Amino acid sequence: AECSVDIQGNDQMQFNTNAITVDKSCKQFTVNLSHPGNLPKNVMGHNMVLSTAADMQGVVTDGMASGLDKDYLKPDDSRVIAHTKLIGSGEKDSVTFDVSKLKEGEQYMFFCTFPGHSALMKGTLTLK
Amino acid sequence: AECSVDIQGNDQMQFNTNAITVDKSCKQFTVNLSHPGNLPKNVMGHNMVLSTAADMQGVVTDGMASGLDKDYLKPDDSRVIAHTKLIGSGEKDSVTFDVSKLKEGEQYMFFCTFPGHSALMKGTLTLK
Ligand code: NI
Ligand code: NI
């Protein structure tokens, strides 16, 4: 609870929220991702990727180009603050990261890098 | 141009038009679908499927449930007036159907049934 949050990304190409705020008291923060649905990861794969608003675009465009083998994320991309695995239906994955990696007054974005999904599957994250 | 429309499906999950006018003087109308870009069928597949605005949702839902091998279309869906195959990048397909299958004052939709795309890839077709 509190320094964790649960996200689901479904077969309708959406996330159950478009805003997460990290509380300034958290030492670490967890994002638990699940995929309700029936569709396979090769058609409707979802991951949770975090970065700044200004970088999102770069991360999606190089993610795309990497492909399904690299879970559509450029390996060791330094713009990526934290990311889960690309999961399909019935799969579950989570990531914990240092709240120290986030600074106040900066717009972060959570999104999915599977092609075309960030048009809908995106959200703001903010450290309050 | 004359009783036919050239249309494009791109890797941004966008068709290059969102309104088709079919002329009453046509015996037939031909739609010519192409897919500029680089992503394959299993990731950014596109088809042009036509039905009444009312049947669209049943076609989209059942299409999803038909699977990738079925080109995400319920085969012999009684509601589909015409459709192309689901094409990936570099590919192309056309469909010619008779104009008598359309009537005056019905609302028709064209759309793509690939998972999550029709919220974005959709337009109106109209008999004038
Ligand atoms: Ni996704
Ligand atoms: Ni499509």
Query: What does the block give as tokens for A118?
Result: 């960030």
Backbone angles phi, psi at B95, to 5 degrees: -145, 130
User: Considering CB atoms only, which of A42, A116, A120 is closest to B44?
Assistant: A116
| Rounded-to-integer distance, Cα A89 and Cα B24, Å | 46
Structure determined via: X-ray
Q: What is the 3-state secondary structure (H, E, C) of chain A?
A: CCCEEEEEECCCCCECCCEEEECCCCCEEEEEEECCCCCCHHHHCECCEEEEHHHHHHHHHHHHHHCHHHCCCCCCCCCCCEECCCECCCCEEEEEEEHHHCCCCCCEEEECCCCCHHHCCEEEEEEC
- What is the DSSP-derived secondary structure letter of residue B14? -
Residues of A with Cβ-Cβ distance to B13 under 8 angstroms: 116, 119
| Rounded-to-integer distance, Cα B6 and Cα B11, Å | 17
The dihedral over CA atoms of A17, B66, B92, B80, expressed in degrees to the nearest 10, equals -100
Q: Given CA atoms B60, B65, B71, B73 in this order, what sign does their dihedral have? A: negative
* Residue among B65, B93, B73 at smallest CA distance from B8: B93
Kindly provide the residue ranges of all beta strands, DSSP E only, lying in B4-91, ordered along the sequence: 4-8, 19-22, 28-34, 49-52, 82-83
Q: Where is the binding site for Cu cation, in residues of A?
A: 46, 112, 117, 121
| Rounded-to-integer distance, Cα A121 and Cα A55, Å | 16
Report the chain A residue with the minimal C-alpha distance to residue B61. Answer: A12
To one decimal, the resolution in angstroms is 2.2
Q: Are A62 and A74 in contact (CB under 8 A)?
A: yes
Backbone angles phi, psi at A66, to 5 degrees: -75, -40
Q: Are B25 and A96 in contact (CB under 8 A)?
A: no
Q: Write out the H or E segment, with its range, that includes residue B44.
A: helix B41-44
- ∠B85-B89-B92 over CA atoms, to 5°? 45
CATH number of the structural domain spanning residue A123: 2.60.40.420
Distance in angstroms between the alpha carbons of the first and the last residue of chain A: 16
Q: Are B40 and B115 in contact (CB under 8 A)?
A: no
Please identify which residue in the block is written with the tokens 């159950």. Answer: A16
Number of domains in chain A: 1
Backbone angles phi, psi at A126, to 5 degrees: -145, 145
Residues of the domain holding B21: 1-128
| DSSP-assigned beta bridge partners for residue B26 | none
The number of C-alpha atoms within 13 Å of B38 and in the hemisphere containing its C-beta is 5
Q: Are A80 and A70 in contact (CB under 8 A)?
A: no
C-beta atoms of A115 and B42 within 8 A: no
User: Which CB contacts under 8 angstroms, 24+ apart, belong to A57-62?
Assistant: A59/A113, A60/A111, A60/A113, A60/A118
**Residue B76: left if φ>0, alpha if ψ -120 to 50, beta else—which one?**
left
| Rounded-to-integer distance, Cα A34 and Cα A87, Å | 8
User: Considering CB atoms only, which of B43, B64, B65 is closest to A115?
Assistant: B43
Coil, helix or strand for B62?
helix
Which residue type does A15 have?
A: F
Q: Are A45 and B44 in contact (CB under 8 A)?
A: no
